[PDB]
Amino acid sequence: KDERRWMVQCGSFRGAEQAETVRAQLAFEGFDSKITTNNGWNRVVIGPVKGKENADSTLNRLKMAGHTNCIRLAAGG
């Protein structure tokens, strides 16, 4: 029951350029994320992902995009 799910939230960076590029980068590197400002900086989040390795890899992958501050947010409402 339940194979673990996610809803990444790669924080928000002042890197407005790295943030916007972060969006295309995350999707260009192999993890189509979804950015959106809110916490003051371009907040990042990827569509409800699955818990196993993708969401976690996204983290290390977010390093591929070149950003500062990220965290995998797990779904649960």
Strand percent estimate: 15-25%
Q: Treating each run of at least 4 consecutive H or I residues as one helix, how many helices?
A: 2
* CA gyration radius, whole angstroms: 12 Å
One letter per element, helices H and strands E, the order comes to: EHEEH
Write down how many β-strands occur, each being a DSSP E stretch of 2 or more residues.
Answer: 3
Return the domain count: 1
PDB class: cell division
Keywords: bacterial cell division protein, RNP domain, cell division, transmembrane, inner membrane
Assembly: monomeric
Entry title: Solution structure of the C-terminal RNP domain from the divisome protein FtsN
Please characterize this protein's 3D structure:
- Belongs to the FtsN family.
- This is Cell division protein FtsN.
- Residues 2-74 form the SPOR domain.
- One of its GO terms (molecular function) is peptidoglycan binding.
- The chain is an alpha+beta fold.
- It has a single domain, classed as Sporulation related repeat (Alpha-Beta Plaits).
- The protein has 2 helices and 3 strands, in the order E-H-E-E-H.
- The protein has helices at residues 16-29, 54-65, and strands spanning 12-13, 33-37, 42-46.
- A 3-stranded antiparallel β-sheet has the order 1-3-2, covered by helices on one side.
- Helix 1 (16-29) crosses helix 2 (54-65).
